[PDB]
Each structure stands twice: as structure tokens, then as C-alpha cells.
């Protein structure tokens, strides 16, 4: 179900994804990064601006550690065989910046940093693959996520290969170009009176079948996708109002 992806097999798997996404345009995703380590400097126009500047100063300094993508169709069905891909990126605990607790939490979750440091994927190359595979831009994709501000922040950083836009509004303009359609499940949960908490708590409340290392990108993306479709029929009349939910990331 979940295909571990490293450098040695990046091209092989992206090629498959290049095809799977044609029939399974709904892709749920999650990431794993080295926590939050910095504090914003300067003035802030509002609470939204402060949250964005907080995200910016951290996204610009850290390196993504893991990306999880689960593909599904309009009816919430998975492609035959492998439905989820977990990309492991190159990270060096001796060179790279990070938050102590986050690394320890990830170690306990199963992340093998040693292998990330030796066989991890190069974001620069992954960026190019994302673009040349029709998963990232203005096509007809539906991105499903959970408490995703940082998740998309890291992706935007990779895809543009530069620091995030200084202004919050500019970041969202760019976000729209690469991910025109995004549904953040945690944001949607604010409209569901009986749903609260993080992914694991929502899975419990929705009685979803958890698959794999319950604390990694791939595993989480699976739950997100399952949560989205169930919630989309249960609390939303089979159709999410874009005016109110599309492109809105929890927190930002």
C-alpha cells in the first residue's frame, strides 16, 4: 500500500505517479520537518501576518524530512496496488538545523535518519520531478491536507527553490498557482460540531482504519484522505463550498 521512496527509486515511482494521478486526481498529503526553531523578527500587520511570519522564518531555515502522498478519485477509491507514496529526503543531524524534541519524536516514530542522510532524496531534483509530472499545477487536482500551513510552506519552498515571499498575500498567490485547490481537513473540522483534535483523534471519532507507522507522512496522508471523503458525505452535502473552504489552511 505504502511505497517507501528514496533517491535510488525516485524516477521509477514518479513515473508511476505521473500516470496514477490521471485517474486519481485527489491527493492527500502530509509532511515531517524538524519542528519549529525560530522566532519572527520585526513588526506585524495582524495576527494572520504574525502567524505567517512565524512560518516564514522557520520554513526558510529548515529542510523537509518526509513527504506523504495518497492518491484517490472523486469517489474516494484508491488505485489498484500502491495508493500511497512516502518520500524520504536527505537530512543530516550533524549539519542541518532542527528542534531537539521534534527529532526525538520522529526517531521514536520510525524515521531512520542514518538512511535519510545516506540515501535520502534531493529536494532540488524532486522539485523538477513534481513540475514535470502534472501533480503540482493548475491542472485539475484536489489536494487534501491536515493542519497544513507548514506542509505547503515546505512544498512552495522546494518548487520555487527560494525563501518564501516576505508578504503573506504573495505567498497565497503563489500557493494558488501550484495548488489551486486545497481542502484542509482540520479547517473543515471547525464546521463539524463533534469533531476535534489532531489526526489520530479524528480517525478515532470517525472510526477510520489506521494503516502503517501511525506518525509518519504516508500513514497520515492515508487518514487525511479517508477523513475527507467520510466527512464530505457525512457533514457536507457531498460538495465542499469552495468560497468558504478552498485554499484555506488551518491557522493561516
Amino acid at each position: 500500500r505504502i511505497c517507501e521512496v528514496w533517491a535510488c527509486n525516485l524516477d521509477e515511482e514518479m513515473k508511476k505517479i505521473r500516470q496514477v494521478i490521471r485517474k486519481y486526481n485527489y491527493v492527500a498529503m502530509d509532511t515531517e520537518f524538524p519542528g519549529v526553531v525560530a522566532r519572527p523578527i520585526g513588526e506585524f500587520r495582524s495576527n494572520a501576518d504574525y502567524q505567517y511570519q512565524l512560518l516564514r522564518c522557520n520554513v526558510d531555515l529548515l529542510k523537509i524530512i518526509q513527504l506523504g502522498l495518497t492518491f484517490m478519485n472523486e469517489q474516494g477509491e484508491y488505485p489498484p496496488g500502491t495508493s500511497t507514496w512516502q518520500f524520504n529526503f536527505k537530512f543530516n543531524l550533524t549539519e542541518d538545523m532542527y528542534a531537539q524534541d521534534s527529532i526525538e519524536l520522529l526517531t521514536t516514530s520510525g524515521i531512520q535518519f542514518k538512511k535519510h542522510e545516506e540515501e535520502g532524496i534531493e529536494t532540488q531534483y524532486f522539485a523538477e520531478l513534481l513540475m514535470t509530472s502534472g501533480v503540482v499545477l493548475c491542472e485539475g487536482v484536489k489536494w487534501l491536507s491536515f493542519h497544513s500551513g507548514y506542509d505547503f510552506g515546505y512544498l512552495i519552498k522546494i518548487l520555487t527553490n527560494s525563501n518564501l515571499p516576505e508578504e503573506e498575500l504573495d505567498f497565497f498567490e503563489i500557493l494558488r498557482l501550484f495548488f489551486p485547490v486545497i481542502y484542509d481537513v482540520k479547517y473543515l473540522m471547525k464546521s463539524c460540531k463533534n469533531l476535534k483534535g489532531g489526526l489520530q483523534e479524528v480517525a478515532e471519532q470517525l472510526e477510520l482504519e489506521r494503516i502503517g507507522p501511525q506518525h509518519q507522512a504516508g500513514s497520515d496522508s492515508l487518514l487525511t484522505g479517508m477523513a475527507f471523503f467520510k466527512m464530505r458525505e457525512m457533514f457536507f452535502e457531498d460538495h465542499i463550498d469552495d468560497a468558504k473552504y478552498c485554499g484555506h489552511l488551518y491557522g493561516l
Binding site: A48, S191, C192, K193, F235, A243, K244, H248
Partner: protein
């Protein structure tokens, strides 16, 4: 039918606006909102399964304001910032069959306004 539930929700929301904004505009806001909500909820009200369509029907007023509130607000000559300004921060109102409840703040408890 759903009339009662909608008015419970409306009277609650409107109670914060009176004596804070022009009486006539608040009245229009109230009346227009009822109309918009009744229109929006038709075909999405299941007294058999009240939870069904809860999210679709949820009315939120926070950083982002529900379009129906913006529409009612515009059609009544009320500045959206004035409406959000006199209501509790991040107010969420659920209007379901036989049950109207709300939540002041993202972490606040869900309180019941009307139930059967």
C-alpha cells in the same frame, strides 16, 4: 419546519447587534439572513438524521466570515467589520433539525440554545 431553528439562531446572533448598530439595519440583516438560510438549507435538512449536513449548514463568523453573513450584511447596509466587531470572536452556530447550538471561540465549549 426548519423555521423555528433558524429564528433561534438568528435571535441569538441579532441580540449582540441591537443597541450597537442602527435598529432598522439590524432588522433587515435579521430578516435577510433568515431568507438566505431558508434558501440555502432547502434539500439539505434531514430531521431523521440531524447531524447530516451539519457542516454544510454551520455558520461561522471569525477571521473569515460566512458568505451568507456577508450577503445579509451587505444587503442591510452594515459594515462587515461592525458585525464581526460586535459578535463574540470566532462564533460558530450549528442549525440542525431539533437542535441549535453555538461555540464562542475555537476552543470553547459547545453550548445548546435549543433542543428537542
Amino acid at each position: 419546519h426548519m423555521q423555528l431553528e433558524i429564528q433561534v439562531a438568528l435571535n441569538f446572533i441579532i441580540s449582540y447587534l441591537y443597541n450597537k448598530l442602527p435598529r432598522r439595519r439590524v432588522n433587515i440583516f435579521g430578516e435577510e439572513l433568515e431568507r438566505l438560510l431558508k434558501k440555502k438549507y432547502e434539500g439539505h435538512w434531514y430531521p431523521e438524521k440531524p447531524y447530516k449536513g451539519s457542516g454544510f449548514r454551520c455558520i461561522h463568523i471569525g477571521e473569515k466570515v460566512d458568505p451568507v453573513i456577508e450577503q445579509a450584511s451587505k444587503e442591510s447596509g452594515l459594515d462587515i467589520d461592525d458585525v464581526r466587531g460586535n459578535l463574540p470572536q470566532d462564533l460558530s452556530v450549528w442549525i440542525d433539525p431539533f437542535e441549535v447550538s453555538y461555540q464562542i471561540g475555537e476552543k470553547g465549549p459547545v453550548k445548546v440554545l435549543y433542543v428537542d
